[model samples]
Target: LNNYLHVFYYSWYGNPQFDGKYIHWNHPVLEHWDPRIAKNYPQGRHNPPDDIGSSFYPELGSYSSRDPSVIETHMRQMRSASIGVLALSWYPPDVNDENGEPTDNLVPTILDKAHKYNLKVTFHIEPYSNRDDQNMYKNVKYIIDKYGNHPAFYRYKTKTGNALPMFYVYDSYITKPEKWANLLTTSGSRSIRNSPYDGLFIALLVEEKHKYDILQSGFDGIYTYFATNGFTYGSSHQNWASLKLFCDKYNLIFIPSVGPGYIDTSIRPWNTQNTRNRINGKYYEIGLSAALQTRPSLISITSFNQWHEGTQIEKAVPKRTSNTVYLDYRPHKPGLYLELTRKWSEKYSKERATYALDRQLP
Candidate 1:
């Protein structure tokens, strides 16, 4: 499989009280979204209950993410679903969000595990404070030097016949195009072009306007990270075809992201407008169908296990806490999402292969 489903992944969960200092295991309530949500849920700065932290409850039941078994389970599930790549959320050394500590050390084991199943790993560089081109240049050099040799590390094959490491720069729009040009543009004074660290950089496109800015920034491609359809132009499935046309004219990669559903109301109960019912897998199928119709070279699933947002394709099960009852995949098996993903991924592979043969015959 040259290019197929690449799912966004997270490795920053742990049991703080039990697993001691387990970074994201102790997520705080979003008082910022609504102070009343914090007052109602009151999960503030606490380790998620065995059956909470998501609209749907996990089959695993408040699992400690730091455990090796958990990581292995994740890789196995993804591989079974024909996922070729895991776009892991990452932060540079000594840098992390307020909710978590440095989890970069997990990469080695992640690489080893992924390689066992022939899956690839790519980095989704999360935005950090003052992440200027200077630091990003160093980041690229660091990643390539450290993990480029790993068999599991993902390197995209470009049209030029070069296989270069790929990175998804989340929140890329925060940085001005002029600033990014210094690192991405070939003609810029401090460009990374022709350097050993030269690679494919994908920026986040949240709005229609950002597409032009992304091209101006010298980025190789654009991705929509939001799972909520209609939340933004880039994220809405209906706009993806138009966006693809724009990308085609500019010779840019258009990576349209799709998700099973969206429901962060567990943390941000007030933001109910964006919640999308899974409708027993119809939502995911429809989104996938839309993205495929655009005929893009690659498609990134919104997430594999972003439970907080309820977009995870990873298996979740029925469970109930003392205070609340969480959602579950009922009237069907817990493995429904995995099976569906497998079917679509294999189908995508065959379609792409047919397209290749058609081109050859012509």
Candidate 2:
């Protein structure tokens, strides 16, 4: 409940020298997937609007995320938006998505840079091959033992009256509740109870049924991850109050996620039904306002640089590549989204200041 504004972040970008090789940006040209997109450039990666995997383009075109200068600049940008915590997307050592290699080594650098901007880093445990409960117990301890002492590692207080490191388990619903109970419950067989590794775990609630599943799995809280409004029961802002009431009954934290807009038409042309127009910036304001109305202790931003999903809040500039034209923030300044974030963040802080500190009373 202490200064809670966590933004979802991705650190999967890489270069040939630093991490291993390039990914995402070094995408292959496809002739299949979407013929409409293929007709323009026949390439999958972003360099233009019609040929890109994302609807909008970045100011640092197809750049490497491992660059120290880029990471430092991003940290400064996030601080300007009043972000207190960064929910960094992470994978196990030697394990990574199809697009990139491992990035566990970057945590220290990320922590160092974020700490410089007065920000905290929390792990968003992503799904990997054979990720069962037993593996999770080991992984949790690994994170705590290795990086717990870092000045910028994120932690939070649970109703148990302990301040433990916080973790957000992405696609947590895939793991059976029985398996999770063994690690999360106090009396489980391989429980980390009374140990330093014991910490708060927030599971993603994608569907309505996952709500009950989370309750049984001994999760500390629930978070809605989807950016599309009507995409899922949990993602819809209209249902937040009801979800919070359920959490209140069970004494769980409800972290509702909000996003500026969504449009990945560049990749998924047929998924046009999910595209949400920013309407210049009013869309983001409405989301922030809705999340605040729930009066929850914390709120999660959908993403900071998930460009493939077209949900990035980072700066984007107008560009016309050799053969294609990219989307720009014209009619409004390139910094419009960041400015909107700052405005609502200040408003949220003031609103939270007036909230009663007595959690028991509420």
Candidate 3:
């Protein structure tokens, strides 16, 4: 609706690498639950792939543990850096641990604490199309019930002036983005809004055709996860630029997905090094540059925790030969090599994001 520099910062609460919140869940909280064995042989609700099974990427267990403290720390650190709101990753009520069992959602606790600081919150729910999809949707409602009503709920719209809150759907199973809108509506209703997730306005993800189709199905106002170029959301190509032009022309919300990098060959383990995942600034520079071009209202980081592919902002703990996701972010180092390329435009985004002047409709 208006121009405003929005940084959608995020972080992970749990991953398969740790023992459900650094020995907290089992050692202290679940003293009677035999946390170790439970974590090892756990089981419960989640779509096959997103659950504890399926493919693409699978967590040996710990990924589902909930630890809000981790999220809180990320929020505080990001705040020190002056970030506004975040599209936090979320799982079902009982985020599954190994074998498939319910556990807490660490991201929520972080959001709770963040509110105290006037930090805005957005849940990044992964949408799926399997049988468990209904359960996932149910979980969305449950989460909304718990925190949507919180006074800290951030709504990034300019009611003559402004505010901000954006949610990102990270699941690849988002074949029905239109149907997804219905769920959002359900959460926004006054009667149904136990927690009232009114801030679910901002969303970003991949799959354009699917998004287009969903919008066609019933989402006339739905412009699911806008993007540019061939990258996720929108980037610097015909597709990307056109989205901004169109959205800008119509005065619509256009959020772009920004990222540091993307790669994960652990599943095959035989890919060439050139084809392997490497951390570098070149990719991020390109994305940042594109974000400037589009003049997006909100900018989302591609991910906080995609550990298997080693694409997480969450740093890992140091120890003896550890490898799943880089616990030690030191390897990526300030990522300062590209300061020459990224520095100039970094400040430009601050200006461009808030400029309300309309780009002429082509």
Candidate 4:
């Protein structure tokens, strides 16, 4: 187990049975940017138990994330998929994204369950309110001080063989590179470069210029976060090889993210052009193959269970509501994506081993 395959995991779903109310399950139908387009689409929040916000329904049936059994099942699923690390979506204490409540309390349970399954956990820091260089430094300190010692807290081995925790900063371009330099560089007032809290910070690559911005900010690496191919410059398959080349020249890590497919029209009704059909797993295979072609240091799955975007590798079942029909992995088994993931993980590990051996040879 090289622990090179990582999956983005979300722990924000809630149902009435466990949390007293539906949290993310009843996600609101987002209005379109244009008033004309918005009128054509339906408005109001989803009524769960039958109609959820996702394009596909889950096998667990509107389960709460706080449920121990849910976490256990998720861990088992990840292990079965040969996923070594889970980049968990995280927010500061008492802070959370819209349509979801604060889930920082769920970290302990997630870590314990991950450890039991021999999986590691890393933070995918979300863009919380008032995010700045100083606040980010404090947040990193808080996370490292609290969970860095945990056995399940993931640490990546550097070329120098030093194992340090890795943090993925989502939507990193919101703040300027100068601000990031303040915390990540050695001489800035709030720099954490040589501090005990120092770790590998990976930035999200969305635009073409982000590569330079990430380098200037002193980030250790870059990762494409979007599951939709061609959705952004970073996520586009054609651009990955060039991005990898840029990273190599700068001595930075390059992790290209792949996904089973993408379809979020369930929530964003108007944004249908970006949908990439699974096509009986062909779409996923293409994504995996493209990423492998780049020979990246690591591969990240866009999601493990982000049903809102229909990018989940987590098992989904067939279901239908009176008004809407849910998508599924019909003809194939519910575990199709998981099996595909394991297959690719094994292939990547073997290829990596051969590459390393070649480097050592004359």
Top-TM-score structure, candidate number: 4
* Worst 10 contiguous positions by lDDT, candidate 2: 42-51
**Backbone clashes counted, model 4:** 0
Error of 3 at 2 (Å): 15
What are the per-residue Cα lDDT tens digits for candidate 4 across 17-96? 88999989899999888998898888888898898989999889899999999999998898999889999999999988
Q: Tell me the TM-score of each prediction against the true structure.
A: 0.94, 0.90, 0.60, 0.98
Model 1 has an lDDT value of: 0.83
- TM-score: which is higher, 3 or 4? 4
Give, for candidate 4, the lowest lDDT window spanning 10 residues.
353-362
Cα lDDT, all candidates = 0.83, 0.81, 0.43, 0.91
Task: State in Å the error of residue 330, model 2.
Answer: 2.3
What's the CA error at residue 148 for candidate 4, in Å? 0.8
Better of 1 and 2 by TM-score: 1
What tens digits encode model 1's per-residue C-alpha lDDT throughout 1-362?
33567999988776655467445534666775556545665556544655355787666556665677788888889988888999999999877777766778778889998898788999999997889888999888888899999999898875566698888999999999999999999997779888888888999999889987899999998999888889999999989999899988998888889999999877776678999999999999998899888888789998898988999988888776676677877877888888888888888877766655336664
* lDDT of each residue in 1-362, candidate 3, tens digit only: 11232333333323444442322112111122455545543243322222211112322223333434455555554444344555554556545423223334455566577676666766555543352324544655666677756765555666453343344555433435444444544442221222333333333324454445433322212223322234344433345576666556554566665555444333213222313222355555576677667666655554444444344444433322222232233445432322322352356545654576573344
**What TM-score would candidate 1 get against the native?**
0.94
Clash count, one per candidate: 1, 0, 21, 0
Best by lDDT: 4
